[model samples]
Target: ITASSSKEYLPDLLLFWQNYEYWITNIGLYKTKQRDLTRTPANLDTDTEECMFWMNYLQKDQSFQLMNFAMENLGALYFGSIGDISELYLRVEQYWDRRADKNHSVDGKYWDALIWSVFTMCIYYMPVEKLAEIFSVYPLHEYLGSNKRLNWEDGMQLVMCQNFARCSLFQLKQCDFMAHPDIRLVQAYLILATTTFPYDEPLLANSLLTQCIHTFKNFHVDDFRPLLNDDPVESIAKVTLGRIFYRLCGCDYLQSGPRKPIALHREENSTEVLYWKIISLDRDLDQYLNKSSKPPLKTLDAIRRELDIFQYKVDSLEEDFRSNNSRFQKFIALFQISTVSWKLFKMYLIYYDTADSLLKVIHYSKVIISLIVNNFHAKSEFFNRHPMVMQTITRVVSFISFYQIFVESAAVKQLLVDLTELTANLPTIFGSKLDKLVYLTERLSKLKLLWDKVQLLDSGDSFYHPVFKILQNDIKIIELKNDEMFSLIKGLGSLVPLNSDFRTIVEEFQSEYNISDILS
Candidate 1:
């Protein structure tokens, strides 16, 4: 049975497998070996001499290991430390324990169910076309050609989905997602956000959120302080909206294409994580901003200190092997800019969020345009990536009187100029934002006419005179910044909308102003 053909084939197989391992781990040698070995495939019979090797190679050949790494990676990325890999094991084992208890039933093995849940979440967000693209170059592709069901495109989707059907065993409703907020649906959203495909689900979920933010404009801390003392009233309107609001907003701020999420796959270091800051930007903003506190210089000092502390952690570890990671550089590049924005954002909330106040809101804006501008990758739409932050920033920009408001020292004025022009330079469906900039720039250019007209009717200003003069004040205009565009802009001066309650505030301004017409 010994033949010269065995010698030729055997060494090729040996090197091919060695190279395959390199391919999985992102090894440097992977490209060089792959270049030589991948050329070896060609015409071979169903039972060809080479065909004997595949079954052994595929059955246990790192396939499961690669898949396991994929799931663990996703769990880490989406669930974070909130879900330990150990917790995944516990859930799976509990599932097994229940199946044995329920009816002495179970169809697949342990890994099968794990893959099933992960696949369920992924496919629910994925389209059949995407499933096909990923299926490319998989071993079973050969099974497709031999069967002669080229119309099998639809059948192919069906067979692939049957993995899901086969998987439906251990329990969890796929379609009944409309019924509840099962945490798994949250998991579905998390994984979908991380996917490379465009399902418009992230966009849908996010737009819904912008609406909630819009609705919150109606809510006043003053209004709530009373109802809750007795425990709930006009509040129930807010309750349902708040629930949808929180869910939608909750899902908005995060993604990445695994293409797996484990550090082995993701390979990005979160400086925020290393600093354990979790954007403690959020934390400090919450603590200081609402106390009506201004951004202290000490927090700036603390932030700098934290960066140094973060540096200290890295240096002490001597993970120079980790080298200078790219995402961390993005954090460093942006952190100074980011520092100002939380203060800016807190400045806005303090200045603008108070429906009762008469103040205005940003010079550091384009720096926070800084946030939206960072996404440069595909279908990586700024709104898609950051609908919440992007819309919040845009909404604020739209509400600004820009040039007229910040006419002061050089630093503040240039900041507005930079933010305004940068925003003007931004792309346009040619309406809403940049178009508004065009209108805003033009309006200010001819503002003398508006002032002269107001001077001529200076007594008609008696209508707005004292109380409503702040009517043009920052509170209402800036109030819109807390949330949507047309919702914010279309009602730019309207007095019926029930949502943002700005309309109500306009009516309240009207009612109080109407009372004054009775004359003192």
Candidate 2:
């Protein structure tokens, strides 16, 4: 059963260990080992790829020692495995030698502890440093297509590096690496990983996702084709992008307060360019409506039946991971892998709300735009004779032109703040938005039973979050204010043809609200 006693398994094990070591440490078989083992010649060409496959296999198997053995002997297997007395290979051999010492239990224990400790620390604590060390020895940029030795090992190598970077210790560093001109693929990989595990622990998952969003915002989109290209790599990148955006609505970023409207010309104009700009705001609401609108209550009823069976399966397995005897048993109350599923459920709800908000914006814009367009059509003959009508239309269209810019700008600002919190979570500096989302969902779930019919009005003057009810009294107040404006405008319209100073009176009112220069 002992690893050393299995001479039959040792060669295969060593081969496995050797393979893993080459990748994790960036060192491989030296010149001497190749000649000694004539069955295979020393192929520098296959070194990186071969090593990567074993690393992944070992990681999946959870064989921490083998993982350690690989790291300790990585450089040796690639560069010095063939040579007798090769410094790198000998350095690794010495660890195995020390590990074999039965007389000194401490030495044996030290070897065992070192293996697991190194695996955990390298992955959890020193992620970026380890990746940097590996990349220093085996630079990825130099290996381009045709010349690039792309293989399963290369894929796994990248995956492992990305997972390590997902930890807080390496997130910002990963961000920095991604900023480098040659590291687009790394950026792509990190983003893809985040999209895969958006609900996992902030330490384990969310940080990397945030980093990708941050990089996408800060970097020039033209330079990064990895997410947009037709390659398999790009395919993964796109999927991740969609998933991350889905989670964005659940984050606090979208819930933050209103921002200052963009500055217009010297005069303040409510009806000039401002009206169109306000109408165009919140365009992403369309995307939310399309993606987050949940299925009917009947569909959920069916889902609940199927989920009951899956829940049983999960509860059964939960026992295996639980520690009932330990004093820390109380901690188990809050710690369950199953909690992740709940987080995903909450994310779906967040998407639903976001979609609703977006849909409202779209609906509001349609109404306002239709009204204005229809009004113009009705007065087309008069408009032809009036320069002011032309000015009004032009100003409305001109202000609306920048609608896309406003929504994206606002979204990006929130995303950046969320990203900062995510990357900071690893160091335990602040709680993650993931935690906040979980709490929000729990609170909302309780209220869903009582959540009945609600009416919403999106008049561009006052917009509310679509999930909650707007006060009936507030709606009446807005309606009264709007009626007054309407009557005044109607009175002015009748006098425009009759009074000599009618134009001047109308101009004064328009100038006060900066609506006058629409024609000019």
User: In terms of TM-score, how similar is model 1 to the real structure?
Assistant: 0.35
Model 1 Cα shift for residue 112 (angstroms): 13
| True-vs-predicted CA distance for residue 264, candidate 2, Å | 43
Query: What global local distance difference test value does model 1 have?
Result: 0.34
> Candidate 1, residues 39-156: lDDT per residue as tens digits?
5564444233332333222233233333354353233233321233444544544543553352422322333334344543343323334444454434444653435443224344
- Per lDDT, the best of the predicted structures is 1
TM-score of each: 0.35, 0.21
| Superposed model 1: Cα runs more than 4 Å off | 1-186, 189-278, 286-384, 388-392, 395-406, 409-418, 421-520
Model 2 poorest ten-residue lDDT run: 25-34
Off by over 4 Å in 2: 1-122, 125-294, 318-520
Cα lDDT tens digits, model 2, 289-397, are 2232434545434544544444453334332212221111111111211222222232233323333443333333333333233323321111111111121222122
> What local distance difference test score does each model get?
0.34, 0.28
